[PDB]
């Protein structure tokens, strides 16, 4: 089976072509932490710690073109599938993990064995190492699951509320002319307030979820970085 | 001065980007694509009927049946298949003629 | 149900079907055509890359002796749990 379809960004691709044929400065970045990894001067890293900037920026742009514009009614999030997000997070996370593993430095994993020599090695430290190795994969899974479920739930809620608003607005507006107009006016104002609140909440939540999605990958990278001090 | 992004053409820059900038990501992407097309590229007729149609499966015309019929007719005509062979029917040609005369 | 139906791609255009046997056979023919010429010795890394992994996978499949039953990959109906056939 081979299905031929198209993403829902064609108009946005046209706009990007129209507006970015000429250069322009970028100063606001959703995830700015990918550009400043070191805060204490004289610390430098021999590992390619800035390799994630390009992928981070492209992912932010793509996910913003999809999610933020999905608030507009009937707009489609073409990539919204659990296993597709699993594929994306697998690509990124496992790529960085295999970059660290291909380094062939086993000492890099010394920190996996949690605790000190005082703790029993077999009955405490080994169990902690097992749990942390499990927690890495769980972090990957959690990133992808959170990204999927936030969008799915928010859009379900928006659709349900819009259906209720349409129903009451269409089939109960005549009450404006009746003696119970005050009840309808109260309900209508309540609905407008909830509409605005839902839109604001979704707007903020999409950006925040993208921030956290990039933050998880940067955290994975940071968990294996070692900084040397200039002398 | 020479820079990959400014001086190289798009295909060359793409090869450079995915060979000397993000080679591990490209390798993992190809691995995942191969897995997807090796284990997630089939759909049975029942699955298509349940979920394969936007508004539902139109049983009143059974498009899957017509699709399979066209497929099989094309295969038979092009490959010169004798569908009356005993293996397809499980009985000899004379037995088939006897059955046709009976029914 | 109805709310769930709103999360589908909205620009589906065409669907093409192909049996695994047919396109696997066509790919094998292409590979044989490109790896046949004399100027590509069997001991070259390219030829081995082309052939060895496929041979190993097919051999693993042939040696398989499973006590359980694996239903046919391309059945007409695989949505029934109580009917592997």
């Amino acid at each position: 089976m081979f299905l031929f379809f198209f993403c829902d960004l064609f108009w946005l691709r046209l706009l990007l072509c129209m507006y970015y044929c000429v250069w322009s400065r970028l100063c606001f970045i959703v995830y700015f932490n990918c550009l400043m990894l070191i805060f204490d001067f004289l610390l430098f890293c021999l590992f390619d710690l800035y390799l994630f900037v390009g992928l981070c920026l492209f992912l932010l742009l793509w996910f913003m073109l999809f999610n933020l514009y999905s608030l507009i009614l009937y707009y489609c999030i073409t990539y919204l599938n659990l296993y597709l997000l699993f594929c994306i997070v697998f690509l990124l996370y496992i790529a960085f993990l295999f970059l660290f593993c291909f380094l062939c430095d086993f000492f890099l994993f010394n920190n996996l064995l949690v605790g000190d020599s005082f703790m029993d090695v077999f009955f405490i430290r080994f169990l902690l190492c097992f749990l942390e190795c499990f927690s890495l994969l769980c972090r990957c899974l959690s990133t992808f699951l959170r990204l999927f479920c936030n969008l799915l739930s928010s859009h379900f809620l928006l659709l349900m509320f819009f259906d209720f608003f349409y129903f009451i607005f269409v089939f109960f507006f005549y009450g404006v002319f009746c003696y119970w107009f005050i009840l309808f006016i109260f309900v209508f104002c309540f609905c407008l307030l909830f509409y605005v609140f839902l839109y604001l909440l979704d707007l903020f939540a999409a950006i925040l979820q993208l921030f956290i999605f990039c933050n998880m990958i940067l955290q994975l990278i940071m968990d294996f970085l070692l900084f040397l001090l200039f002398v | 001065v020479y820079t990959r992004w400014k001086c190289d053409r798009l295909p060359v820059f793409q090869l450079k980007l995915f060979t000397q900038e993000y080679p591990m990501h490209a390798a993992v992407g190809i691995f995942t694509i191969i897995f997807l097309w090796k284990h997630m590229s089939h759909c049975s007729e029942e699955t298509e009927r349940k979920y394969g149609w936007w508004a539902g499966y139109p049983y009143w015309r059974d498009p899957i049946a017509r699709r399979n019929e066209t497929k099989y007719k094309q295969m038979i005509i092009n490959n010169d298949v004798d569908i009356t062979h005993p293996k397809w029917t499980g009985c000899s040609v004379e037995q088939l003629e006897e059955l046709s005369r009976v029914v | 149900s109805n709310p769930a139906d709103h999360f589908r791609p909205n620009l589906k255009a065409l669907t093409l079907y192909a049996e695994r046997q047919h396109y696997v056979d066509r790919w094998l023919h292409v590979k044989e055509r490109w790896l046949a010429p004399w100027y590509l010795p069997w001991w070259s890394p390219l030829f081995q890359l082309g052939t060895w992994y496929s041979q190993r996978s097919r051999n693993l499949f042939l040696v398989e002796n499973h006590l359980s039953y694996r239903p046919y990959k391309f059945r007409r109906n695989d949505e029934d749990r109580n009917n592997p056939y």
């Binding site: 993403c7 599938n81 | 798009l10 793409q14 694509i33 997807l36 590229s41 759909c43 979920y51 | -």
Partner: peptide, 29 residues
Amino acid sequence: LEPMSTWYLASWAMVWYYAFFFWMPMVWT
């Protein structure tokens, strides 16, 4: 739910793979 489906997962993921391998270089340059 299609978001939970896998009967056409490969064709569905082709969109992301095209975006990553063919559109990222263009947005990059």
